[PDB]
């Protein structure tokens, strides 16, 4: 359980991040970043919905959850790491965009994270552009 729980910890971090950075004071860049995070969290919820359906069919277990959640585990770890880094440096505007670029580079190792971050960076630069 404790190997999976970091995903839920990351989720609680992402949720708090979204809530904070969806206040007008935190800036439009952070607003759009929170909106993208809201999309991703909806995706997460859909995934967990499907896993709940498979539970309710009595057709999932432990390792299957552990197996099914591994892509999501990595994704949510990445998302929460980005959110925590952006929050702790209180980045706004081009600062935040810089941080997003650098993170996108550091997340070059895994293609899932690369795709997620490229989507996010395009979207968030849309307001800034």
């Amino acid at each position: 359980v404790s190997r999976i729980l970091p995903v839920a910890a990351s989720y609680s971090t992402v949720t708090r991040f979204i809530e904070e950075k969806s206040s007008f004071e935190y800036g439009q860049v952070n607003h759009a970043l929170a909106a993208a995070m809201r999309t991703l969290v909806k995706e997460y919820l859909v995934l967990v919905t499907q896993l709940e359906q498979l539970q309710r069919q009595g057709l999932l277990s432990l390792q299957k959850l552990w197996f099914y959640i591994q892509p999501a585990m990595r994704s949510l770890d990445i998302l929460a790491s980005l959110a925590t880094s952006v929050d702790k440096g209180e980045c706004i505007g081009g600062a935040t965009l810089s941080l997003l670029h650098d993170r996108s580079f550091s997340y070059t190792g895994d293609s899932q994270a690369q795709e997620l971050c490229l989507h996010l960076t395009k979207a968030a630069s849309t307001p800034y552009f």
Binding site: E43, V46, L47, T49, Q50, Q53, P71
Partner: protein, 67 residues
């Protein structure tokens, strides 16, 4: 020739399923029938939209969700 080209193109859009007084003999079921049919069409279309959104959600809940 532009009108001719439009003529050939005509019917190529999406089909549409939805878009002093009476003399005492003008009392006609056709007007009231038309009104009834319209009020049927509204309701029916709304329940069809509800069914279709329900089916879409049912499929998605049966779908993996990451693609």
């Amino acid at each position: 020739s532009v009108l001719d080209l439009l003529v050939q193109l005509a019917g190529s859009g999406p089909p549409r399923v939805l878009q002093n007084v009476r003399y005492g003999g003008y009392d006609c079921c056709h007007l009231s029938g038309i009104e009834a049919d319209v009020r049927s069409i509204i309701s029916g279309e709304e329940e069809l939209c509800r069914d279709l959104i329900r089916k879409t959600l049912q499929v998605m809940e049966a779908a993996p969700g990451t693609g």
